[PDB]
Amino acid sequence: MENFQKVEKIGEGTYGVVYKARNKLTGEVVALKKIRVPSTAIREISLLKELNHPNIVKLLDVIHTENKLYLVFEFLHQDLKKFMDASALTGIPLPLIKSYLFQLLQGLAFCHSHRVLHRDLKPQNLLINTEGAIKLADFTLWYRAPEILLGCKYYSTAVDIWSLGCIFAEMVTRRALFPGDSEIDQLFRIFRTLGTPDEVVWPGVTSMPDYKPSFPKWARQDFSKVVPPLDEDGRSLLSQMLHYDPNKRISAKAALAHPFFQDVTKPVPHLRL
Ligand SMILES: COc1cc(N)ccc1-c1ccc2c(-c3nc4c(N5CCN(C)CC5)cccc4[nH]3)n[nH]c2c1
Ligand SMILES: COc1cc(N)ccc1-c1ccc2c(-c3nc4c(N5CCN(C)CC5)cccc4[nH]3)n[nH]c2c1
């Protein structure tokens, strides 16, 4: 760590504080996470160093010293949450929403092809640069897939597609799709929009660990009401990302081929830094 000069505290993460720092050896400005250590951890994290892709924030170095673990990452200057908040009066233009969605699907398609899932996508860990890029980082209950909320412990890559669908909707409407403040409030916010799931639409749902037959029965709403002026291609894609049954939920790879991306481009955002 004497090889790192802390510049400022970036965040108070899930497993430790994150600082903007300078690597004194290379001169590079990096994001440094101090984890608050298991050997099983070292090996798992050491693998993620290899997982390199333009839409995944790079793990540059893993430093294990004095029974402490420091993870050093590529640094980006802004997160999607900040940008969403800054774009709130006007909205993010559709071409940039589409670009960001496309890129995140590429990142996910890459990760998922290596059997690695994110598990906790949210605007706060999606990072953007001045080039029009958006990147997955860390690779709130608002973005949690229903199978996680229903107690499935062996969930799949589909959980990330759900979270991204929630983020897509939020970019479009400038409001969170399912802003729950408890696990059951989250689940019931989902049910009140998409309908209480049953064995017809989600085979196996009634045997999920935390499923209760006493769940109230709500009817499904029209997507046109849920994500207004989003066009039919967008709503079609969103509907497939938000399928209850994780086995019917669209994959990242299939999503990339959806007609919504027929005219995708890569605009440059206006970033105030
Ligand atoms: C801001 O850095 C960049 C900006 C841009 N735009 C482009 C490239 C880079 C860049 C720079 C360095 C590196 C290294 C690297 N160098 C060293 C090292 N050197 C450092 C040089 N010298 C004093 C002797 C000791 C010592 C130990 C580990 C190292 N790893 N790998 N990849 C790099 C990429
Ligand atoms: C464990 O962290 C990781 C794990 C993995 N596996 C992969 C990546 C990362 C990672 C995380 C963050 C960053 C950043 C960065 N974050 C911010 C930032 N924050 C404040 C608001 N919010 C709460 C978060 C965003 C605000 C301004 C500038 C920033 N730059 N650069 N690189 C990172 C790499």
Using DSSP's 3-state secondary structure scheme, residue 103 falls into helix
In the chain, the DSSP E strands lie at 4-12, 17-23, 29-35, 59-65, 68-74, 78-79, 126-128, 134-136
d(CA 88, CA 172): 10
CA angle 30, 159, 271 (to 5 degrees): 40
Q: Tell me which residue has its CA closest to atom 1 in ligand 1.
A: 28
Pick the atom of ligand 1 nearest to 27's CA: 1
- Residue 78: exposed, middle, or buried by beta-carbon count in 10 A (0-12, 13-18, 19+)? middle
- The pairing of strands 59-65 and 78-79 is unpaired
Best mutation site among 8, 17, 76, 116 for ligand 2 pocket (most ligand atoms within 8 Å of CB): 76
**73 marked as binding residue:** no
What's the 32 CA to ligand 1 centre distance in angstroms? 17
Q: Tell me which residue has its CA closest to atom 16 in ligand 1.
A: 26
241 Cβ contact partners less than 8 Å away, ≥ 6 residues apart: 161, 162, 164, 165, 168, 249, 250, 255
Using DSSP's 3-state secondary structure scheme, residue 36 falls into coil
**18 marked as binding residue:** yes
d(CA 254, CA 199): 25
Tokens of 82: 């900040």
Closest CA to 246 of 201, 206, 207: 201
Q: Is the CB of 28 under 6 A from ligand 1?
A: yes
Main-chain dihedrals φ then ψ at residue 3, nearest 5 degrees: -80, 5
**138 marked as binding residue:** yes
Q: Where are the domains of the chain?
A: 1-77, 78-271
Q: Is the CB of 27 under 6 A from ligand 1?
A: yes
Q: Which ligand is nearest to the CA of 72?
A: 2
Buried b (16+ CB within 10 A) or exposed e, 58-75: bbbbbebeeeebbbbbbb
213 Cβ contact partners less than 8 Å away, ≥ 6 residues apart: 206
d(CA 125, CA 139): 9
Pick the CATH number of 1-77 from 3.40.50.720, 3.30.200.20, 3.30.70.2390, 2.130.10.10: 3.30.200.20
Experimental method: X-ray
Tokens of 30: 């990096």
**11 marked as binding residue:** yes
Q: Please report the DSSP string for 190-251 in residue order.
A: HHHHH----TTTSTTGGGSTT--TTS---PPPPHHHHSTT--HHHHHHHHHHT-SSTTTSPP
Q: Is the CB of 33 under 6 A from ligand 2?
A: yes
What's the 91 CA to ligand 2 centre distance in angstroms? 23
Are 126 and 140 in contact, with CB atoms under 8 Å apart?
no
Topology annotation, domain 78-271 = Transferase(Phosphotransferase); domain 1 (1.10.510)
d(CA 273, CA 271): 6
Length of the chain: 273
d(CA 263, CA 210): 42
Q: How many CB atoms lie within 10 A of CB 235?
A: 19
